[PDB]
Design a binder for this molecule. Sequence first.
Ligand SMILES: NC(=[NH2+])NCCC[C@H](N)C(=O)O
Ligand SMILES: [Ca+2]
Ligand SMILES: [Cl-]
Ligand SMILES: [Cl-]
Ligand SMILES: [Cl-]
Length: 223
Amino acid sequence: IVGGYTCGANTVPYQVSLNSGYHFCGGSLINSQWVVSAAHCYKSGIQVRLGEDNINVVEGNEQFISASKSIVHPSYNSNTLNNDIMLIKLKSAASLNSRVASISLPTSCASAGTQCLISGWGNTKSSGTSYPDVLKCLKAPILSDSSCKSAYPGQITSNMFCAGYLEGGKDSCQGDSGGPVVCSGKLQGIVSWGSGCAQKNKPGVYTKVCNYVSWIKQTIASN
Ligand SMILES: NC(=[NH2+])NCCC[C@H](N)C(=O)O
Ligand SMILES: [Ca+2]
Ligand SMILES: [Cl-]
Ligand SMILES: [Cl-]
Ligand SMILES: [Cl-]
């Protein structure tokens, strides 16, 4: 997160860190056994870490659970990042508490204008590199589909939306990949891609979770 703020420990109980020896991606808990993330974060040997603030310090609220299974969207295109969504099932079910909690799936698509909260352990600098140990948060509006396509000609499908600031300064960034965009207590987005971070006229691009609710629910019902 560039230009964000320190969330506070466990103030985002649905934020998970994907760890293969190191945090590499964010993710969102949607029930005790399942995480939603970005297809482009797929690798094997994933450990899901819940209850995290500082990812380099054991602080007392962690649950570390190995993934049993990852499932990339049947139609994921790694070139265009179309359908950048993936599900991860835990080997055992998490203990849900006040600091480890699912976020609801949307019952409907959120609109341009809607204020949202984006979070992750990504780079905090727009030029240069600087990874924080504790969780960062960003309040950002969903932008119009027209300004989103203007800003990224020929690259925005119906499975993507922009959120943030055309003036730049504030954004998701590398290492936030796969993590949440929550709007009014529903998960509307997954941190997907963008051109650089926090650049003028180059806002973050997020997978549009509302489009995927059938697939998610159908998938969790049979795995
Ligand atoms: N145009 C942008 N600055 N987009 C934000 C880039 C963040 C991107 N989701 C990543 O983690 O790599
Ligand atoms: Ca920790
Ligand atoms: Cl701060
Ligand atoms: Cl615990
Ligand atoms: Cl529009």
